[PDB]
Amino acid sequence: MDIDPYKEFGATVELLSFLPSDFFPSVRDLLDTAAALYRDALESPEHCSPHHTALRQAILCWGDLMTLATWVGTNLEDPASRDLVVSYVNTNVGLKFRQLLWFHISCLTFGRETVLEYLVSFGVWIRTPPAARPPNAPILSTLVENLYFQ
Amino acid sequence: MDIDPYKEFGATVELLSFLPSDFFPSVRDLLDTAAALYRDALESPEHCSPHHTALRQAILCWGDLMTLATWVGTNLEDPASRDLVVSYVNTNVGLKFRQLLWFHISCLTFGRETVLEYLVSFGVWIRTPPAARPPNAPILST
Amino acid sequence: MDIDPYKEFGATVELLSFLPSDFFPSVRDLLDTAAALYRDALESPEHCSPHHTALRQAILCWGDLMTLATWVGTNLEDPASRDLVVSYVNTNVGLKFRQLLWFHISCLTFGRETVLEYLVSFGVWIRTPPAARPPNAPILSTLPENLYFQ
Amino acid sequence: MDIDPYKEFGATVELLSFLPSDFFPSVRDLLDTAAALYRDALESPEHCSPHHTALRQAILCWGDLMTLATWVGTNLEDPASRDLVVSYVNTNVGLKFRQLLWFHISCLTFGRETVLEYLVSFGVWIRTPPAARPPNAPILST
Amino acid sequence: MDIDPYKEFGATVELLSFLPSDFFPSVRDLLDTAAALYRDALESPEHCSPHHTALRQAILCWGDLMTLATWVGTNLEDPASRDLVVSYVNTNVGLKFRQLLWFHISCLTFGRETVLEYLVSFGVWIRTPPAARPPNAPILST
Amino acid sequence: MDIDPYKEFGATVELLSFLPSDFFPSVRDLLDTAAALYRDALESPEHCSPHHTALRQAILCWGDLMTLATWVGTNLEDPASRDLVVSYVNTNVGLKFRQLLWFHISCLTFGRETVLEYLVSFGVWIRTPPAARPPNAPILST
Ligand SMILES: COC(=O)C1=C(CN2CC(F)(F)C[C@H]2C(=O)O)NC(c2nccs2)=N[C@H]1c1ccc(F)cc1Cl
Ligand SMILES: COC(=O)C1=C(CN2CC(F)(F)C[C@H]2C(=O)O)NC(c2nccs2)=N[C@H]1c1ccc(F)cc1Cl
Ligand SMILES: COC(=O)C1=C(CN2CC(F)(F)C[C@H]2C(=O)O)NC(c2nccs2)=N[C@H]1c1ccc(F)cc1Cl
Ligand SMILES: COC(=O)C1=C(CN2CC(F)(F)C[C@H]2C(=O)O)NC(c2nccs2)=N[C@H]1c1ccc(F)cc1Cl
Ligand SMILES: COC(=O)C1=C(CN2CC(F)(F)C[C@H]2C(=O)O)NC(c2nccs2)=N[C@H]1c1ccc(F)cc1Cl
Ligand SMILES: COC(=O)C1=C(CN2CC(F)(F)C[C@H]2C(=O)O)NC(c2nccs2)=N[C@H]1c1ccc(F)cc1Cl
Ligand SMILES: [Cl-]
Ligand SMILES: [Cl-]
Ligand SMILES: [Cl-]
């Protein structure tokens, strides 16, 4: 079975990989943000939306991963070979969940197409040589003849 | 945050806990069953249903957990540091995912009501003394 | 004072004793079952029914007994007198509470009249020589309303 | 399960805790009093009331507890260990049943509303400095 | 800034000081009483009244003070300085909070005017020579 | 009793905790600001608002806490014991009161809804990687 967690939400793992790790908040900051904005919906008996359902699982899975990793770290041989487990989370599964949690939280806040446009805008900005690009990053929340039809 | 994965699906962790561990298929057998019955839906770009959305994540999370567990296990050469890891998976996170995967797969197949009534029927059957109970278990499809 | 806990429910200690100890689930399994079927009612501010009131007290009383028995067991030095306390619970008060808890839970589920007729049916079945009786026990659910104002 | 015996009767464990231990009659005196006032109703085939149902179980439970404690207590040899059981009963489960038995007996006699306001009245009287408070306690019946 | 906690409630620190220390219940007994009478209002999302708001902060401030005093007491080497910390709380901030907690709880129960007249009534009674005064204190609820 | 000081003001301790410690002005700077903006109201015999009532108690509670801390500090001879007491308030109760004083002062100035939206705005901004976020923080007065 080849399941892409982003496919049902109009994205792909390959698209989220266009963003380097430095772009994403930490998991703990993503989790704290999910609580501050969406705790009541996330804890409710109502589906709310597919992003809500998915985000619920991602949060619980991270708990699963940390419980197992902590149990491994609390009973493994060298209290120096924990730096390896911590590093393995940071270099591998940590970035995956930063991508995933950021994706659902930001989609719930700004909508999929704003999220997907910002994904490419920032991924292009950060690949432009710093001496040739605008000093500040593009901004996620951003975006006459209104008078004619008054 | 205290999230119960079953709450949006009309159940609770405690209700699933009413079923003994011996009740559930293995994770591998649940995953192969999800593929045989629902692969095309699980792999499609359509949400399909909230159970589909949840099951997609549960399957992927298991991969995450096993990747971590195997990588830890393949870099241990003491089988007292190795069989312990397998035992921890079997007794702890393995049982959680057997409950979760069975719940979503069976709900997709039979409906929540049927699943919730069978949870109670079987949990009560198995707690009845074997000499006083029907020799065969109740049947989910009915 | 001579109080029979079953008398207000149209039964008697003697009638409940017609079932052998082998018939009843364990206390733990009756407690799990009461929670699985009736947790919300048992925890509510509503009486619900005399069976609910009784089952509430029975559950808490068992807690009292286990607390006392555990405190006694933690202050006994002989590890064979600790097993004697365990045996005293199982042979004496344990059977009493298995009878009582089963009675109230089954009555809430199937009704008093079904419960009492099953009591007699199973009690007669188990007393029939195994070579002369049906190979399987009778079944509670196969047997074929006061509002309690106050 | 978290069951509060007083909740279905419009009270709580913590509310009964507002009264000091010295406020309650002894278990024996409560048992004598239930017998003197309500023996016939308690022994009848009529439910009579939720308080009757509860009090029936509380009385029998105390019997269960005393049988166990007596069976334990009659099998020790050190008279400082025997008294240790007596102290543990008095400090713990004895106070719980004094609270419970008084509550149901007093409710049957005076009504829940009178009982609850007396719990508050006496609880406040006993917490007032003795040199500042009325020389006699408040009275349940009035 | 010179803030008197009683000023917005029609009283003053000097007026509460007219009652001797022995008049007031202990902080523990005031906290238990606030819970018994007003727990639901105090914990509710509704302001309810300025007394509710003030009492909410007073309770939490006492928690803060006890946390600090406990942390200080557990890190003092000299166990005679620890008892000194205990004495300083009882003689100083403990008395201030007995005044404050009593004031808000009694105002919620009997109203401001009854409380303030009782303050003067008891303050005058206790300053009358015991051989010349009525044997019993005046009564707040009358 | 479980009282959240923000609940009657439409917030919770958890929501205020979303802001890191370095977001908040110092207690002294908050107290100076309360004096410069609201001294006459805080000292007046009028309730003014629940925020006024709450802020009045918070200021006096900090006074209580500092009086206790100063009395302890003036009776410690070791200047490293005094620095630890100073450090403990800053790490602990100081942060609680910085949160509290800021919340009431900013609510009186800008309104609850602006304050709550700003807590989330700044809380999200500071969790965005500095190389990916706007160089300047969002502005409370918008
Ligand atoms: C809700 O309780 C029940 O449904 C019971 C049935 C439900 N039955 C369980 C079954 F035996 F498996 C068949 C089924 C039925 O009656 O159809 N049978 C019996 C008994 N039969 C013989 C001795 S006890 N007892 C209760 C019961 C069982 C297990 C438990 F943990 C708690 C309870 Cl209250
Ligand atoms: C779609 O899955 C099923 O149909 C299930 C059946 C279908 N039943 C299988 C059967 F037990 F063989 C009879 C049949 C039925 O209900 O008719 N029974 C049970 C359970 N029954 C008792 C404990 S679990 N669980 C699921 C299931 C079984 C195996 C598996 F690998 C994955 C799943 Cl989701
Ligand atoms: C709810 O508070 C009260 O009812 C008060 C009474 C009610 N009275 C208690 C009584 F003294 F017993 C008589 C009764 C009354 O006024 O009728 N009297 C007094 C005081 N009287 C003298 C000094 S303090 N204070 C309060 C009170 C008492 C105890 C406590 F723990 C907390 C409080 Cl707020
Ligand atoms: C039958 O119940 C009663 O009438 C009670 C009275 C009623 N009367 C007792 C009295 F104290 F003598 C006055 C009188 C009344 O209220 O008029 N007072 C009190 C209490 N008062 C203070 C602490 S407990 N408790 C119950 C009671 C008393 C003794 C006993 F063994 C069992 C019970 Cl349930
Ligand atoms: C609710 O989530 C957000 O509003 C996000 C913003 C909101 N923006 C934060 C800001 F950078 F400060 C500006 C603001 C805006 O878009 O106006 N920006 C970004 C990112 N920008 C660049 C890289 S990630 N990601 C999310 C976010 C940020 C922090 C966090 F802990 C969790 C999340 Cl989901
Ligand atoms: C009256 O209080 C204020 O106006 C506040 C401003 C007003 N702003 C101060 C400014 F940052 F300088 C710009 C201005 C504005 O919002 O327009 N900003 C902020 C904060 N912003 C980020 C973290 S705290 N907090 C309060 C405040 C500031 C200092 C102080 F001593 C006490 C208080 Cl209550
Ligand atoms: Cl009888
Ligand atoms: Cl004096
Ligand atoms: Cl609470």
Coordinates of N, CA and C and ligand atoms in Angstrom, one line a residue, chain B residues 124-125 127-128 132-134, chain C residues 23 25 29-30 33 37 102 105-106 109-110 118 122 139-141, ligand 1:
Chain B
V124 N -18.7 -9.2 27.0 CA -19.5 -9.9 28.0 C -19.4 -11.4 27.8
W125 N -19.4 -11.9 26.6 CA -19.3 -13.3 26.4 C -18.0 -13.9 27.0
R127 N -16.2 -12.7 29.4 CA -16.1 -12.6 30.9 C -17.1 -13.6 31.6
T128 N -17.9 -14.3 30.8 CA -18.8 -15.3 31.3 C -18.0 -16.6 31.5
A132 N -20.3 -21.9 31.5 CA -21.7 -21.4 31.6 C -22.1 -20.7 30.3
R133 N -21.2 -20.5 29.3 CA -21.4 -19.7 28.2 C -21.6 -20.5 26.9
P134 N -22.1 -19.9 25.9 CA -22.2 -20.6 24.6 C -20.8 -21.0 24.1
Chain C
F23 N -20.8 -20.3 38.5 CA -21.6 -19.6 37.6 C -21.3 -18.2 37.3
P25 N -19.3 -14.5 36.9 CA -18.1 -13.8 36.6 C -17.4 -13.3 37.8
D29 N -14.6 -8.5 36.5 CA -15.3 -8.5 35.2 C -16.7 -7.9 35.3
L30 N -17.4 -8.1 36.5 CA -18.7 -7.5 36.7 C -18.5 -6.0 36.8
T33 N -18.0 -4.6 33.4 CA -19.3 -4.7 32.6 C -20.3 -3.6 33.1
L37 N -21.6 -0.8 30.4 CA -23.0 -0.6 30.0 C -23.6 0.6 30.7
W102 N -23.8 -9.3 39.9 CA -24.4 -9.9 38.8 C -25.9 -9.7 38.8
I105 N -26.8 -6.0 37.8 CA -26.4 -5.7 36.4 C -27.3 -6.4 35.4
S106 N -27.6 -7.7 35.7 CA -28.4 -8.5 34.8 C -29.9 -8.0 34.8
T109 N -30.3 -5.1 32.6 CA -30.1 -5.5 31.2 C -31.3 -6.3 30.7
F110 N -31.8 -7.3 31.5 CA -32.8 -8.2 31.0 C -34.1 -8.2 31.8
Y118 N -33.9 -17.4 34.9 CA -32.6 -18.0 34.4 C -31.9 -18.6 35.6
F122 N -30.7 -22.3 35.1 CA -29.3 -22.7 35.2 C -29.0 -23.5 36.5
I139 N -29.3 -20.1 28.2 CA -28.8 -18.8 27.8 C -29.7 -17.7 28.3
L140 N -29.1 -16.7 29.0 CA -29.9 -15.7 29.7 C -30.8 -14.9 28.7
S141 N -30.1 -14.5 27.6 CA -30.9 -13.6 26.7 C -32.0 -14.3 25.9
Ligands
LIG1 C1 -25.0 -7.5 30.7 O1 -24.7 -8.8 31.3 C2 -25.0 -10.0 30.5 O2 -25.3 -9.7 29.4 C3 -24.9 -11.4 31.0 C4 -25.0 -12.4 30.1 C5 -25.0 -12.5 28.6 N1 -24.7 -13.8 28.1 C6 -23.2 -14.0 28.1 C7 -23.1 -15.3 27.3 F1 -23.0 -16.4 28.1 F2 -22.0 -15.3 26.6 C8 -24.4 -15.4 26.4 C9 -25.2 -14.1 26.7 C10 -26.7 -14.3 26.5 O3 -27.4 -14.4 27.5 O4 -27.1 -14.3 25.3 N2 -24.9 -13.8 30.6 C11 -24.5 -14.0 32.0 C12 -24.3 -15.5 32.5 N3 -24.5 -16.6 31.9 C13 -24.1 -17.8 32.7 C14 -23.5 -17.4 33.9 S1 -23.5 -15.7 34.1 N4 -24.3 -13.0 32.8 C15 -24.4 -11.6 32.4 C16 -22.9 -11.1 32.7 C17 -21.8 -11.8 32.0 C18 -20.4 -11.4 32.1 C19 -20.1 -10.3 32.9 F3 -18.8 -10.0 33.1 C20 -21.1 -9.6 33.6 C21 -22.4 -10.0 33.4 CL1 -23.7 -9.2 34.4

